[PDB]
């Protein structure tokens, strides 16, 4: 086995040939390299093949428009929930609806991700990151509401909570209440 020669045959062609008159670009894949090399096997003297390689880069616009922008908007909501006042009562609604939306996005992607177990794709890592972040937003919103609905008939304020949240933190966070 050898390599094919060029049109005016003097020299070998060590790559995949593409004819511009007949070639349809893929639309999802850019061909970066296309070499060609003979391969042997030291254990098998009778083996010889001619392999053609196609190094191809994916164009991810579809996945950007259908997965990353919605997740950025969900993360914006999950940070917004801490700006709400507890007297509004729309806090659990915001947090848990964000969770339901991330579940819908997971459903959306359930049919488009490779089903191999040698690694986890970065897009699924990003989705699980956002999902766990929304979950922790839910947990801390519950904690905030619990602290907000406390009263002397049920709880007595300890000293470490008072020190940390009435003297140490407000000066940093620039939230000193009116004297």
């Amino acid at each position: 086995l050898q390599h094919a020669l060029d049109a005016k045959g003097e020299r070998e062609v060590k790559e995949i040939v593409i004819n511009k008159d007949a070639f349809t670009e893929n639309g999802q894949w850019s061909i970066e390299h296309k070499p060609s090399r003979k391969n042997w096997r030291s254990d098998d003297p009778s083996y010889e093949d001619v392999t053609f390689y196609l190094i191809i880069q994916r164009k991810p616009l579809f996945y950007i428009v259908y997965t990353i922008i919605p997740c950025i908007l969900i993360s914006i909501l999950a940070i917004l929930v801490f700006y709400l006042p507890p007297d509004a009562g729309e806090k659990m609604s915001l947090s848990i609806s964000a969770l339901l939306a991330v579940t819908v996005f997971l459903l959306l992607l359930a049919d488009k991700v490779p089903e191999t177990s040698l690694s986890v794709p970065i897009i699924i890592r990003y989705l699980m990151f956002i999902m766990i972040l929304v979950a922790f937003s839910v947990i801390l919103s519950v904690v905030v509401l619990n602290l907000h609905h406390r009263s002397p008939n049920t709880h007595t304020m300890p000293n470490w909570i008072r020190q940390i949240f009435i003297e140490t933190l407000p000066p940093f966070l620039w939230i000193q209440r009116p004297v």
Binding site: F62, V65, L73, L80, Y83, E90, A101, K112, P178
Partner: protein
């Protein structure tokens, strides 16, 4: 094809072209009209009084409906990357405006629930939000 030679099999071909336009009616009925009329409601969220506890629920449910239309649309086109379909462009634009409505409602709420024990009513904020803007927006008394 003059770059090739008449002694090969790549020099000649007869091609037949079909230019076909899509009749948009299925999509106009099952996707566009529902999505546009559900999306308009997120702006009606700005007319609900704050003393109702449903300003946020309305806009967030509109965003969940949009996420269901996004799931439906994601299944009809190829995953090519030469352009963004007009439908996906509308989807991203409308979902980002609904997200902005949700954030703006959260800010209205934050300002509504302020009390002398936690915040101060600036004379500046009383100059902007209490006499000039109302008169410009032509609001009741």
């Amino acid at each position: 094809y003059p770059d090739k030679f008449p002694n090969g099999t790549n020099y000649q071909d007869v091609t037949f072209y079909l230019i076909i336009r899509r009749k948009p009616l299925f999509y106009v009925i099952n996707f566009i009209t529902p999505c546009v009329l559900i999306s308009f409601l997120a702006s009606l969220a700005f007319y609900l009084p704050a003393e109702s506890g449903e300003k946020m629920s309305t806009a967030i449910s509109v965003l969940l409906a949009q996420a269901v239309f996004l799931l439906l649309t994601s299944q009809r086109l190829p995953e090519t990357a030469l352009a963004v379909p007009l439908i996906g462009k509308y989807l991203m634009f409308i979902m980002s405006l609904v997200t902005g409505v949700i954030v703006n409602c959260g800010i209205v709420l934050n300002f509504h629930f302020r009390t002398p024990s936690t915040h101060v009513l600036s004379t500046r904020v009383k100059q902007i939000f209490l006499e000039k803007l109302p008169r410009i927006l032509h609001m009741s008394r």
